């Protein structure tokens, strides 16, 4: 930008309806701070966000280290406080060819004094004179009454800790909404009724893609069932709702009487009422716990060696 706003009034711009190519962001080799809390810069090309907010101001060298989530000082407490669960990161670089003129650049004003601690992501523009003692301060500027905004001394020959650094703060939000801003990754064709692992708007899972007749509200993007698993996909390229059919859905219990002891095993299906089975086999027996195949059934009652469930016991005999 041709100019940057002050510290007490930081300009924030919403970024949306575009793909965010971060490859020209973390590979600039001209910035000075890229400590990104939470998400990693290598994963920024894969994740998808609801919206991107980019704050901006100009700060000195000594206060660029105190814009972390948990910190204190005269900037994090009074001027710009990040949340403890902040997503994204700040970006700072040297600004000496610009924003540095002889005689001091007193255009910017930081909040030296304030009545209370600043809430996260809150911008405070107030010029009321702060008082200290019990004396009234109705617009006066006497003793124990100072202007809350203090100017900055930015000279080309000033110290490195007091040099003006252009700070831009990228913040990412993850809300229950379609992601209008995503990484520069492309998109392949859509397949149906096949057990294919998928990558839908940053959500990765394996399943079978099937058409869903459910009506989906525009506010939501993902549908979760009682089991808290993915069931609905918006698919923003085509904007149609697909039901995620799991590749494996039933309960299978394998009655294995060891490996070296015997090579014959029995398969018990919990959700099958004896088909969607591995094999038909023989000696199909239906119990209260489900359908059991590959094991014989007898009318005798022996001791329980390998329990099956609901009083059903199976053993390896001659």
């Amino acid at each position, epitope marked *: *930008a041709t100019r940057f706003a002050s510290v007490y009034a930081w300009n924030r*711009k*919403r970024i949306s309806n575009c793909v965010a190519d971060y490859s020209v962001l973390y590979n600039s080799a001209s910035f000075s701070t890229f400590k990104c809390y939470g998400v990693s810069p290598t994963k920024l090309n894969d994740l998808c966000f609801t919206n991107v*907010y980019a704050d*901006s101001f100009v700060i000195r060298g000594d206060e660029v280290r105190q814009i972390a989530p948990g910190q204190t000082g005269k900037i994090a407490d009074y001027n710009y406080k990040l949340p403890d669960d902040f997503t994204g990161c700040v970006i700072a670089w040297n600004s000496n060819n610009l924003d540095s003129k002889v005689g001091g650049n*007193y255009n910017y*004003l930081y909040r030296l004094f304030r009545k209370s601690n600043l809430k996260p*992501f*809150e911008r405070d523009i107030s*010029t009321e004179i702060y008082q200290a003692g019990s004396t009234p301060c109705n617009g006066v500027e006497g003793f124990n009454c100072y202007f809350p905004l203090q100017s900055y001394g930015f000279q080309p020959t000033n110290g490195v800790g007091y040099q003006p650094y252009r700070v831009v703060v990228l913040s990412f939000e993850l809300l229950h909404a379609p992601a209008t801003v995503c990484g520069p990754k492309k998109s392949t064709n859509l397949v149906k009724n096949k057990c294919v692992n998928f990558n839908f708007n940053g959500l990765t899972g394996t399943g079978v893609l099937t058409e869903s007749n459910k009506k989906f509200l525009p506010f939501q993007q993902f549908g979760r069932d009682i089991a808290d698993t993915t069931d609905a996909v918006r698919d923003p390229q085509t904007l149609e709702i697909l039901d995620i059919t799991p590749c494996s859905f039933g309960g299978v219990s394998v009655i294995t009487p060891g490996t070296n002891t015997s090579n014959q095993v029995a398969v018990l299906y919990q959700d099958v009422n004896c088909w969607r089975v591995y094999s038909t086999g023989s000696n199909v027996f239906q119990t209260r716990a489900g359908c059991l195949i590959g094991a014989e059934h007898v009318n005798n009652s022996y001791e329980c060696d390998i329990p099956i469930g609901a009083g059903i016991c199976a053993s390896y005999q001659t």
Partner: antibody
Framework: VQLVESGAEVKKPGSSVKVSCKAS????????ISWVRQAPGQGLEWMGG????????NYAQKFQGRVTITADKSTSTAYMELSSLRSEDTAVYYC?????????????????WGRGTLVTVSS | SVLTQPPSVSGAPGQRVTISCTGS?????????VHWYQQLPGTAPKLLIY???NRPSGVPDRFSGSKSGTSASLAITGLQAEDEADYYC???????????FGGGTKLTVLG
């Protein structure tokens, strides 16, 4: 209070003007002063903002080399000066007092406005 | 700059009128509050609504505004014979680094 201004002025197309906004009934004690023009038949246009305590000023990106604004903390008077007048500079110029507040958006608002000075150019 | 509003609106004393004020991502969609300024034909504009909900003293309760998404809405319950004025929505822009006013709505009630 009341932020009265000067009377209507007529200037040449290519001269410089000098208007004032005097705070009557009080002073703009630690409150920033802004200026807004209004062309006849057009919306309000922002000139610049001055906080009189620090004596600093800023201007919009549309114009920076033709407008210079100053203020006096003692006599409580803020001024304009518009050099290089053109034929499209005819408007009514108001002095406005910014009233800031704390919040998430926190957009500046001008609650106290001046009486308006008519400035026109005629060869 | 980009604070476009309908050039004119119409209404009756017995109904409701809604004034729309849309912008861009950097002025309204970013979260900045909007400010409404009623300019009577012949005097200086005054602060009608600031903070998108707060009413300064003197302004009647009939002047209620709201902000949602990337747009601003101003609603008037009762329209008397003195409500004929130009209404400008004002907010803060990030690219211009300055306050921006609305294009102007010619609210005319006459017959």
């Amino acid at each position: 209070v009341q932020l009265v201004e000067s009377g209507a002025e007529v200037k040449k197309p290519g001269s410089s003007v000098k208007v004032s906004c005097k705070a009557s009934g009080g002073t703009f004690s630690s409150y920033a002063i802004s200026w807004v023009r209004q062309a006849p038949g057009q919306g309000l246009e922002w000139m610049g903002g001055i906080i009189p305590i620090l004596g600093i000023a800023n201007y919009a990106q549309k114009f920076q080399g033709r407008v210079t604004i100053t203020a006096d903390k003692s006599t409580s008077t803020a001024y304009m000066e518009l050099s290089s007048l053109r034929s499209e500079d005819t408007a009514v110029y108001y002095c406005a007092r910014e009233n800031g507040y704390s919040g998430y958006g926190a957009a500046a608002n001008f609650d106290l406005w001046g009486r308006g000075t008519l400035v026109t150019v005629s060869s | 700059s980009v604070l476009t509003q309908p050039p004119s609106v119409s209404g009756a004393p017995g109904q409701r009128v809604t004034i729309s004020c849309t912008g861009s991502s950097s002025n309204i969609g970013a979260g900045y509050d909007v400010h409404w300024y009623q300019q009577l034909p012949g005097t200086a504009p005054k602060l009608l609504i600031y903070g998108n909900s707060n009413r300064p003293s003197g302004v009647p309760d009939r002047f209620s505004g709201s902000k949602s998404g990337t747009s601003a809405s101003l609603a008037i319950t009762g329209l008397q014979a003195e409500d004929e004025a130009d209404y400008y929505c004002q907010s803060y822009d990030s690219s211009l680094s300055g306050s921006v006013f609305g294009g102007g709505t010619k609210l005319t009630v006459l017959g």
